[PDB]
Amino acid sequence: PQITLWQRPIVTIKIGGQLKEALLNTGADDTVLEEVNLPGRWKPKLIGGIGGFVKVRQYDQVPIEICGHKVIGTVLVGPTPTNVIGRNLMTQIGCTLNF
Amino acid sequence: PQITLWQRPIVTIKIGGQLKEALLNTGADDTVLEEVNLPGRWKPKLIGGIGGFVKVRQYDQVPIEICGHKVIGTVLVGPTPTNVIGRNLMTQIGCTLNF
C-alpha cells in the first residue's frame, strides 16, 4: 500500500496466533508488542533509557504478518504504551519513505 | 527520494536560518527541535506524558526546508533527545510509507 501520514499509520498484524494492531514507527529501531504469548526461546533486553530502563523479552526470528506481508524478525514483548512496528520489521516488508 | 529503513532516517533541514539534522519519525504526531531561535509568536505546549509532561514552545506556520522541500508547519521547540520531524511536517513534504 501507499500510506499517507495525515493519521497515525496503524496497521493490522498477525502474531503468535493473534490479530493485533500496531503503529508503523520509523523512529523506533525495534518492534515492541504487548499481550502476546510467543513460543520458543527468549532473553531479557533493556530498552528505553529515559528515567531508567524497561526490561522486555527478546524473541528472535519470530514469524509475523504485517498488513498481509509474511516476514520474520526480532520481536520485543513487554508493556508498551502502543504496539510498535520498528525499522527492523519495516525493512523486512520492504517499507520505504517516499517523497 | 526513496529512503530505506536499514538505518535511522536522518535528513538535513533548514530552520530559523540554521542547518540541522532531524529524524523522519512516523511514530511522532509533532515536530520537536532543540537549539533553534525562531522569530515571531509562540505559546507553551505540554507534550509527552510519561513520567510527567515536557513543556515546549509552539510556533505555528514556521517555514522549514526538509531534505530540499520548502514547507510550512508547526514546530515545537525545546528539549528533545533527538530532533524529530513528525507526521505534521511529513504530510507537508508529501512523504508516504510504501510497501
Binding site: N25 | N25, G27
Partner: peptide, 7 residues
C-alpha cells in the same frame, strides 16, 4: 531508540 510521540 523508540521515538514515538502521541503528543
Amino acid at each position: 531508540g523508540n521515538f514515538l510521540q502521541s503528543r
